[PDB]
Design a binder for this molecule. Structure first.
Ligand SMILES: CO[C@@H]1C(=O)CC[C@@](C)(O)[C@@]1(O)[C@@]1(C)O[C@@H]1CC=C(C)C
Ligand SMILES: [Co+2]
Ligand SMILES: [Co+2]
Ligand SMILES: [Co+2]
Ligand SMILES: [K+]
Length: 305
């Protein structure tokens, strides 16, 4: 019998799977019975990092801007009483309204159109019938697919008033991300970002999840490079102009250890304490990076409003 690590439980049944009208272009895994991607299988095992063409950069700018618009739709719905399923429904419609496919939907049979990660959920939480509670923290992770390209971002949000521990965890996590982004430029080793993130997390009494990493993204949802967020990692590769990847630190109040729910997706702290995450998709430029998933109409993430 599965022993839950914290207070959270899945709230079933799920509403029937939401359809995407056929005029929306679909990634290859959308119609695979196990949600496997033939294009991913063909590239599996590569450590070759794509140098994006100008056409690819235009494709990544567009899908990442639309992904930010969809996260912003989700951010507007965060309040006590709203279920994660209701947020996912709004996200699904917002994706379709922008002629995008919701990348998570049927990815290895993932059942929903975004990931909603409350409290002790590290990542990949499945939207369900649980209403958000005053005091919760919730990550919404949006991945969209447009014209052959995926874009990926996430923010952690407060549900009503939260305690000082929630404030410190979310603020430190956001700082970890911005300190890592600020280091991105040609010639920096991908393994260096984890030293920066862990140094800031540890300084604030938090741990860094080891089982999940930032990743290459463009024609595949994940590919080279692998970008760990913890110190002294063995990530292979050196940043060059035209590289596109995510940085998405998952930081925990307690220990770093994770386990998975019987659903096969929900990653939780083994100790049941809270975890927060922020994510941007980055394009390395000749001298810095472009934050493809940046908020355009505000300097700050939603939790600071
Ligand atoms: C590199 O992996 C990724 C990782 O470590 C960070 C967290 C995820 C969710 O992005 C990841 O786990 C993905 C890409 O494998 C997961 C499949 C994606 C969805 C939306 C279900
Ligand atoms: Co993501
Ligand atoms: Co990601
Ligand atoms: Co995969
Ligand atoms: K969380």
């Amino acid at each position: 019998p599965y022993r839950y690590t914290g207070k959270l439980r899945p709230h079933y049944p799920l509403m029937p799977t939401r359809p995407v009208p056929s005029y929306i272009q679909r990634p290859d895994y959308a119609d695979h019975p196990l949600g496997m991607s033939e294009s991913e299988q063909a590239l599996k095992g590569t450590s070759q990092i794509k140098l994006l063409s100008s056409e690819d950069i235009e494709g990544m700018r567009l899908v990442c801007r639309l992904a930010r618009e969809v996260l912003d739709v989700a951010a507007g719905m965060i309040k006590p009483g709203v279920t994660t399923e209701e947020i996912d429904h709004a996200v699904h419609l917002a994706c379709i309204a922008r002629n995008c496919y919701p990348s998570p939907l049927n990815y290895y049979n993932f059942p929903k159109s975004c990931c909603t990660s409350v409290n002790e959920v590290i990542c990949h939480g499945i939207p369900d019938r649980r209403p958000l509670q005053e005091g919760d923290i919730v990550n919404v992770d949006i991945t969209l697919y447009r014209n052959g390209y995926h874009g990926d971002l996430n923010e952690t949000f407060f549900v009503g008033e939260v305690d000082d521990g929630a404030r410190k965890l979310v603020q430190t996590t956001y700082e970890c991300l911005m300190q890592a982004i600020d280091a991105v430029k040609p010639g920096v080793r991908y393994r260096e970002l984890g030293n920066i993130i862990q140094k800031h997390a540890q300084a604030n009494g938090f741990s860094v999840v080891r089982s999940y990493c930032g990743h290459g993204i463009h024609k595949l949802m994940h590919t080279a490079p692998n970008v760990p967020h913890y110190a002294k990692n063995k990530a292979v590769g050196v940043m060059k102009s035209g590289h596109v990847f995510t940085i998405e630190p998952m930081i925990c109040e307690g220990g770093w250890q994770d386990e998975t729910w019987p659903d096969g997706w929900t990653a939780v702290t083994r100790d049941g304490k809270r975890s927060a995450q922020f994510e941007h998709t980055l394009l390395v430029t000749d001298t810095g990076c472009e934050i493809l998933t940046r908020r355009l109409d505000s300097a700050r993430p939603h939790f600071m409003s």
